[PDB]
Amino acid sequence: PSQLSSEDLARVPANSTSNILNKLLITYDPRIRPNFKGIPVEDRVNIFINSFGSIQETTMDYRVNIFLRQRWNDPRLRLPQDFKSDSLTVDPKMFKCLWKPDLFFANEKSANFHDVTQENILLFIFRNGDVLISMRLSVTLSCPLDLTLFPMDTQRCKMQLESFGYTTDDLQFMWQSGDPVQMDEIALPQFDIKQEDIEYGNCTKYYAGTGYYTCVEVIFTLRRQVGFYMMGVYAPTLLIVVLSWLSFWINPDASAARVPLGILSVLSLSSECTSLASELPKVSYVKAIDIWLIACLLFGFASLVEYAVVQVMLNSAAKRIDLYARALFPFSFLFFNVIYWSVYL
């Protein structure tokens, strides 16, 4: 319960914080933007990033903890020569009597303030009417991820800052000249952030008849390390395929030896692929890892099939098939690797 002009007599504010703003907040309407019916106001926005992570492919979102700072000019808050100190601090419980821009994030799903011991918001007023507001947030933006080339993929996550109900004719947003987005020394479980965040130009929104709306955009680029999948998933599957070619050098009369070798190589590849179904993300379409696993199964499957060919030709030389398949199965598998790489790189 506060008013810009209310009847109350208190002699204790004497050149204090409380004494000076009440003279400033006389006939001051918080619902009227600065320079009403004139030049639109301009905001300088910079973002400091504290925490980054919790990147999820199930819900396509990621959580960021930020520091947000905005600056503008209010000619109605001139500071005269009567007060000696340059800056003033507004008590955080009473922002309802001051004008602030209506900023919001376009791709925001959930956000909250921080009040661990006090409210983490401050506001300064300078001599020339400049207003500085700084605050701490915990947003949950949305990042659409494309997992087609899943083991080696690059994702671009997006951050947007719009105005809810002011057009470009009244409120415009600007990045700071220097250091608009700053980073810290943190680590990520799977991805790897880059210190090349491009501050994309203003993606001003156009709507059906309402008018233009200002927005500013910053893009983060993420790359995925391939160390675990290349040695834990790729290398074991390569070794089983070599063991499928092992039966070409065994004698054809060993029916009880080549058959269990050819059927246990299929079981090893079948067990390896189905064990990773509970570890890889579920996207319900074909990824780059799934093409490798099914093509390796065909090579193990074709090794046992050709033995049935050579086993029936003998009881009807006919060892030229094993001589031909010795220089054919590794020769055709080499072309698949050249095709599989140099496409995904």
């Binding site: 029916s255 058959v259 065909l298 049935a308």
Partner: protein
């Protein structure tokens, strides 16, 4: 000074009351609604629900707020005093949790024109209930329902209407892993009938289709290859007992691990799906592949000796073509009754 003009519009001196609907004791109120969708996802099979982030816009007319002396048409209202204006009591029927947004300010807006039209825009998140069935899990099409209805007004006071153009819009570049959201949407009327009267309601329908890329390459093609591998035994010489028995029982073990290992990525239900019938029949085919060899092995050396050998040789010759033909007949009937429904 637009702020002091509101006291002349509504207040103690004015007769405006927030508890009385416009056009009292007269015709009902027409409300026009639009919906803009920003996010869509989190299709949960276990809890039978999904999440959505929307923009809601409602328009109506209030004759008590008309004015003619103030020059400009637009007149915005501060969100801190939104309780002084009559608003419709819209709510979502299949709603399981919702909240507003206060990321920096209130994400609400109220605009009053000169004639009396009122524009009201808010931004909310929803967790809507969508019942679904997985009788044919890999080949299924599901429908999502989003209903908007009044809480305490009948036909005589409040009527909801969809917008003439641009009723439901979806933000560009929207994706979700499991499903594909089709562009066609249906706008229907579902008026509720109760023992107290008729309550207005409007609904929008979304059609969802699942992709067959991952299931065909992971659970169908490897299951087909193992069955073909079990037919190799019909070409091996019948005297190789350790080779034919070892091949037959290993294919059964390979099929079991394929079925048991794939249940992690499948949804948890308790009724039979279409993927379960494929795995059960494929297990039945490799079960019978080893069992015919016992008939071959027992008929041989049972005791003129070439008569019994020719009897056992005709079993492998007949089953060499009977097994692939039977599997083809089942394969045709499976895709006809499922992919073409």
């Amino acid at each position: 000074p637009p702020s002091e003009f509101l006291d002349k519009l509504m207040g103690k001196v004015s007769g405006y009351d927030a508890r009385i609907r416009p056009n009292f004791k007269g015709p009902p109120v027409n409300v026009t609604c639009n919906i803009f969708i920003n996010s869509f996802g989190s299709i949960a099979e276990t809890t039978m629900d999904y999440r959505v982030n929307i923009f809601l816009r409602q328009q109506w007319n209030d004759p008590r707020l008309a004015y003619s002396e103030y020059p400009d048409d637009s007149l915005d209202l501060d969100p801190s005093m939104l309780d002084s204006i009559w608003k419709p009591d819209l709510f979502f029927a299949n709603e399981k949790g919702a909240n507003f947004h206060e990321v920096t300010t209130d994400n609400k807006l109220l605009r009053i024109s000169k004639n009396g039209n009122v524009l009201y825009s808010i931004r909310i998140t929803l967790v809507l209930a969508c019942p679904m069935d997985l009788k044919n899990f890999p080949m299924d099409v599901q429908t999502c329902i989003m209903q908007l209805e009044s809480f305490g007004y009948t036909m005589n006071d409040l009527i909801f209407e969809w917008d003439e153009k641009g009723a439901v819009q979806v933000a560009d570049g929207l994706t979700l892993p499991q499903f594909i959201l089709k562009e066609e949407k249906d706008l229907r009327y579902c008026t509720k009938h109760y023992n107290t009267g008729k309550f207005t309601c409007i609904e929008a329908r979304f059609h969802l289709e699942r992709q067959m890329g991952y299931y065909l390459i992971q659970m169908y093609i490897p299951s087909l290859l193992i069955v073909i591998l079990s037919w190799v035994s019909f070409w091996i010489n019948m005297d190789a007992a350790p080779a034919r028995v070892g091949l037959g029982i290993t294919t059964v073990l390979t099929m079991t691990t394929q079925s048991s290992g794939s249940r992690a990525s499948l949804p948890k239900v308790s009724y039979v799906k279409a993927i379960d019938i494929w795995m059960a029949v494929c297990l039945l085919f490799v079960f019978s592949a080893l069992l015919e060899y016992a008939a071959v092995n027992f008929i041989a050396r049972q005791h003129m000796r070439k008569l019994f050998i020719s009897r056992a040789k005709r079993i492998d010759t007949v089953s060499r073509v009977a097994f692939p033909l039977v599997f083809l007949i089942f394969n045709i009937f499976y895709w006809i009754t499922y992919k073409i429904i």
